[PDB]
Structure 1
């Protein structure tokens, strides 16, 4: 089998992407944030504290004839941005772009933190990291990809995120019309439960390539590109008027400045992030100060190849017995 679904930015800055997902019988369609940095599929629901729901579409398991309570199961997750959610668990039928999993763990939120309530466009998350990170207790549950894998024509999914435009998540096949040149594959460590890999270096604009190992994760659920402070400093030093603002919480720059591209290495291959991808607009309405899309990972504890990086590529998440990652230009 295969599946193919369009993913759409939630706003004009690509702050996140939402993908429609069918849950239950008859189908209830929710728009979920596909997140290769986590491993829980959780939704706003009929069980979510009413004061914590504000415009989201909810899953109502009682209206689904295929929903079954996963008795005794609870879940609770906290993300890197300090947001969180928790609740209980149903199994139900879940379909993404034509691909159907029966008995998928659907984690029903009883509680969500403020940032989730405040974002009316995201109805939940669909985790695509490794199932070892799944938070369901007492019995860890598998991701949608893990459950689908054996049925797929090929045990892979691909992320093709758009710049200020929709893109595509495919399951079970590689669309050879969706990228230019060849796909370069690179090794993955699953030891932290992430699609963790080692970039071979970077360049700033037309500058020469610096060969240096950068360990990080391919994370569709993180908006920006987070790299070591040395790397990030070298980038913003090439932007007139840029500075790191503690009050803002990272690098900002005047919107009158031209942003250089940023190149990262995948083996001997190179992915070029155009300068425009690194502009995340005024820090506040009417401000001449713009937020940068490349920021320091210092104090995160890991480097994150978020959407800023991934949307410059066609990315293969290869879930073969030994997982790997593939990157192509497009």
Structure 2
């Protein structure tokens, strides 16, 4: 099954899922970086403006709802949400599964007031699941209906017209229509996390980073490519970028000429061009242009680690192989 995704400003990719009976619709991000499912709850106080602006699941309207109530808190690198567990049936592109999810009652204005999506569907392993809740993909696998024990991601480049699909997730395989050439796999450092060994990072013709090796979390839920603060400072220094509060800018007229950035993964160099990582919104030297690469210190046990997000997947179609505990990459088409 494939799920059509909407692309919002190249930073948000989300699709629809149905919860309850009758189905209550929600826009959600499919996140390989987390392992829980959650949507805003009707029990979320309207004092949380984010709840006033998103779809709210109302258990009292679903006949398939099963109460639980265990509280849980989900912590992401850029924000936190809190609530309680509930069980109901969920629709994901034709597949139906009974799933335990979180009803969020505390949704911070910053950053959720900036979210086009309502919730999140974690595609990670149960090892990282908060409350030890069985992840949705595991429940799907349990049905023995998927052709293959894998899921893939396609994140299109932003578009000014509504004729192009923002992206696409495939449960059970990959869509040959959105990649070309062959997949090149890398084994997961360890099952339980969509993280792989990265052999090196280069800026221009000089592998000046991640020498001696480092970690790379392949995170479909992250908007950008991130690295430790030290790594980024070094990388950004080589680009001549200026560190801002939340990001890094560069004189727009300078954007088109920034050097290539490569990521050495499993014996293959994955190269991004300035066009691939800078939001080229102008060529003016009197304006600043943001880079789709940020600094982010991911704490243990998962980090320190670099994170390959939308900026990376936009260029390389990505297959997540559960059965073989490896990740596949192929040039996106």
Paired position in structure 2 for 1:108: 103
Cα contact 1:271–1:328 (8 A) shared by 2: no
Structure 2, unaligned stretches of length 5 or more? 160-165
Cross-structure match for 1:148:
140
| Partner deviation per Cα, 1:31-54 (whole Å, 9 max, x = no partner) | 012111111101012111112113
Query: What are the equivalent positions in structure 2 for 1:147-166 lying under 5 Å apart?
Result: 147-150=139-142, 151=144, 152-165=146-159, 166=166
**Displacement after TM superposition at 1:280 (Å):** 3.9
Over the aligned positions, Cα root-mean-square deviation in angstroms equals 2.5
- Cα distance change of structure 1 residues 119 and 228 upon mapping to structure 2, 3 Å threshold: closer
Note the 1:1-330 alignment, pairs <5 A: 3-10=1-8, 12=9, 14-52=10-48, 53-70=51-68, 72-81=69-78, 83-101=79-97, 103-136=98-131, 140-150=132-142, 151=144, 152-165=146-159, 166-190=166-190, 193-205=192-204, 207=205, 212=211, 213-228=213-228, 232=232, 235-237=235-237, 239=239, 242-245=240-243, 247-257=244-254, 258=256, 259-280=258-279, 288-297=287-296, 301-320=304-323, 322-330=324-332
Which runs of 5 or more residues in structure 1 are unaligned? Answer: none
TM-score, normalised to structure 1's length?
Answer: 0.85
TM-score w.r.t. structure 2 length?
Answer: 0.85
Higher helix share: 2
Q: CA deviation at 1:111?
A: 1.3
Q: Which moved more, 1:109-118 or 1:210-219?
A: 210-219
CA deviation vs aligned residue, 1:246-279 (integer Å, no higher than 9, x gap):
x524432011112333222222223232322312
2:320 aligned counterpart, secondary structure: strand
Q: 1:74 deviation in Å?
A: 1.8
Alignment deviations for residues 147-169 of structure 1 (CA, whole Å, 9 cap, x no partner) = 11232111101011112151110
Equivalent residue pairs, number: 311
Give the superposition deviation at 1:293.
1.7
Q: Quick one: structure 1 residues 324 and 314, their matched pair in 2 at CA, closer, same or farther if it must change by over 3 Å? A: same
